[PDB]
Design a protein around this ligand. Sequence first.
Ligand SMILES: *[C@@H]1O[C@H](CO)[C@@H](O[C@@H]2O[C@H](CO)[C@@H](O)[C@H](O)[C@H]2NC(C)=O)[C@H](O)[C@H]1NC(C)=O
Lengths: 222, 211, 211
Amino acid sequence: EVQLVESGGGLVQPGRSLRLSCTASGFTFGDYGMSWFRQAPGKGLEWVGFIRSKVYGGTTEYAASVKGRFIISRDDSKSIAYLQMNSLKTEDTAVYYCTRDWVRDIILLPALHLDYWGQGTLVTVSGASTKGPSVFPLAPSGGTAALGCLVKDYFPEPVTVSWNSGALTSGVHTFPAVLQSSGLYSLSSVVTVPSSSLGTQTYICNVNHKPSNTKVDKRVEP
Amino acid sequence: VLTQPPSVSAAPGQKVTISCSGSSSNIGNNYVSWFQQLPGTAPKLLIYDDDKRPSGIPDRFSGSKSGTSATLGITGLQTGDEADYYCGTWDSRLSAGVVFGGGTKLTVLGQPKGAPSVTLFPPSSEELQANKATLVCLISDFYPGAVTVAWKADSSPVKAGVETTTPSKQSNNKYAASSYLSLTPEQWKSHRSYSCQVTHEGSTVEKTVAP
Amino acid sequence: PLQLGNCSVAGWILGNPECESLISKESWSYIVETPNPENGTCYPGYFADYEELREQLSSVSSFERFEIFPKESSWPNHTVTGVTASCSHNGKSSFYRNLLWLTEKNGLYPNLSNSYVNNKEKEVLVLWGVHHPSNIRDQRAIYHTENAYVSVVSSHYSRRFTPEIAKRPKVRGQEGRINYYWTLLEPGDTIIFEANGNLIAPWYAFALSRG
Ligand SMILES: *[C@@H]1O[C@H](CO)[C@@H](O[C@@H]2O[C@H](CO)[C@@H](O)[C@H](O)[C@H]2NC(C)=O)[C@H](O)[C@H]1NC(C)=O
């Protein structure tokens, strides 16, 4: 179907710049306006800006929060919308989403027909240095057994945990990370399996911390 | 900016309505859209153009507007409907642009009590080799998200090293949690019993591991 | 001889965006059309007294197009950049090159009153339009007023217009309509436009002597 995929988020120092990207698939990109929204952790939806379709001039509108500092552009050759952020401050830290939208005909306002969103990307405006994670296995002992992985002492968010390279959605649960007294995050992922299936097969967790370019595959054995 | 009720509570199968009051600039004369956002997910378009529904939205969701306030209605209440709901609109004032409501968390009442499933891993082989030791207590699948976690070391309540999540929400609509107790490998083996006492609605589950 | 090419009298006198490359001439014996010119009223609606207009423009001894209300200076408290996908040009939305879609600005549509005085020592042809949206939610979003009026007052032309909302069959992707009206203004006469919404104001007029 319609699918919007975003990238570019990561750690960036205050005052620096960062260019977000939002790739569209499954529809005529040139016939839709595009909008960027953002959401601080647990703090509700906010509007960043909006870019009209080429049919309606390809012009842009921006929130007062952002107008002078961010610039929104689109590339209909590659079906991609960009969010060029400059002069970032700590309060710009949020998950940023991209959307497709209708352009109203006469008044050229956004119709707020945000029927499709990207998965979002996290932007951390901070002055602390990136720290890669340590990954430790959580070995297992009803008739089930629980095994997992400990992703310890990383900064900043996010970390993506997979199980046997993104294949296992069965019995998986990755828990929200915790901030520690050191400003470092740490989370755990766990999977539940039949206990006689332990000496039976493989179980690898694939931890990915892109801010530190860390990719670890850990094996959990009894 | 638009104003929404911070929380709205309703039993299943009931009529439930969320208010979104604005001004003549934004809600009085512009179209209103309603969004559902389950915990940690991209928002979903429920209503647009004050009452229209996109493809895939069931008939249970409806919207209405009268003057300066707009309302969203959900008629057949499911447990899957327990999420956050936002109202958005355009504000024709000079540079107000798109404005939203503060958000409204809808909680479905009458949900069965859920006992917390607790798993406590001891410090692993590799971490002990790294001169560190973290005890990971995982708590999930409890619907009333009012857990009290309490660590104890050989019957003694410990204060140092404990850091606890705040309850989450997952695809079961029940809550989930996690708590880590940091200690040196020595505190690990100077005792023989560390426990993770998880109390949820009076009754308490606890698991104990051992060096 | 005046060759309108593939444009009707309506599309040429209103300034359809896809007829701008029609060579203007100040004197013609008659008008040459085609079996069905492709470009007429790009926005659907009723052209009042069209046959009488074609008769009045049949032959002309003097014909000058001039800007009756300058866009950048006539409506400072109203939005002037209204364009529609129906009247497109080079693949981009535009509007009639002789009209102007006034909409709300900063949440307001103040009462307007614009006068024109015929100082051309000729009779001027003035054209305007009355907007008929397809629903009340569009009337609010476009103008921020619900009960709109449009009046035109001259010595030999005076009419209170009826901007009625009505959903009509979708033509050229539009369920609303623009009704086009016109009049001939004698030398020295003053036409006055007054509206609180729904006025497609004249941008350019035509001073003609009508040989
Ligand atoms: C548009 O609105 C402005 C108000 O900001 C009008 O400007 C004022 O007009 C009054 C009387 O006409 C003057 O006394 C003021 O000095 C003007 N300026 C201000 C800042 O108030 C303006 O006339 C309006 N334009 C039209 C075409 O009506």
